[PDB]
Every structure is written in C-alpha cells, then in structure tokens.
Amino acid sequence: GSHMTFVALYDYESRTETDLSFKKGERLQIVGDWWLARSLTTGKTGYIPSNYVAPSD
C-alpha cells in the first residue's frame, strides 16, 4: 500500500549488466537481498541492494 517505495541511504555504482546505480536521496519503486527497482529519477530499471534503501513516500 506504500511499502514498495524507497529512498537511497547511500550512493551506489553499478557493477554488472543487471544492477542499477543510484545516488543518496534518489527514490526507487520496487517492481531477498537484491530487489528489482525502477529509479524515480531516471526511469531505469535494475537490481538494487535492499539494505541501501529505506522506506519513503
């Protein structure tokens, strides 16, 4: 109901073909430890480390 939107607590740089870079404060919508997410800044989709993000509006 709102547990699928998150905000980045730390910067993250992509390592592979499937992960998603993001900056601290960037909001992510979620589509385990790695979550498929869409950046609400760039609209790009990829996997993010779930411990790098926290619930957000």
Ligand X SMILES: COC[C@H]1O[C@@H]2O[C@H]3[C@H](O)[C@@H](OC)[C@@H](O[C@H]4[C@H](O)[C@@H](O)[C@@H](O[C@H]5[C@H](O)[C@@H](O)[C@@H](O[C@H]6[C@H](OC)[C@@H](O)[C@@H](O[C@H]7[C@H](OC)[C@@H](OC)[C@@H](O[C@H]8[C@H](O)[C@@H](OC)[C@@H](O[C@H]1[C@H](O)[C@H]2OC)O[C@@H]8CO)O[C@@H]7CO)O[C@@H]6CO)O[C@@H]5CO)O[C@@H]4CO)O[C@@H]3CO
Which residues form the interface with ligand X (CB under 6 A)?
42-43
Q: Give the angle subtended at the CA of 36 by the CAs of 21 and 53, to the nearest 5°.
A: 60
Length of the chain: 57
Distance CA 23, CA 8 (A): 7
Contact call for residues 55 and 9 (beta carbons, < 8 A) = no
Report in angstroms how near the CB of residue 33 gets to Ni ion at its nearest: 19
Q: Which does 43 bind (CB under 5 to 8 A by kind): Ni ion, ligand X, none?
A: ligand X
Report in angstroms how near the CB of residue 7 gets to ligand X at its nearest: 16
Residue 15 sits in the site that holds Ni ion (CB under 5 A): no
Binding site for Ni ion (CB under 5 A): 1-3
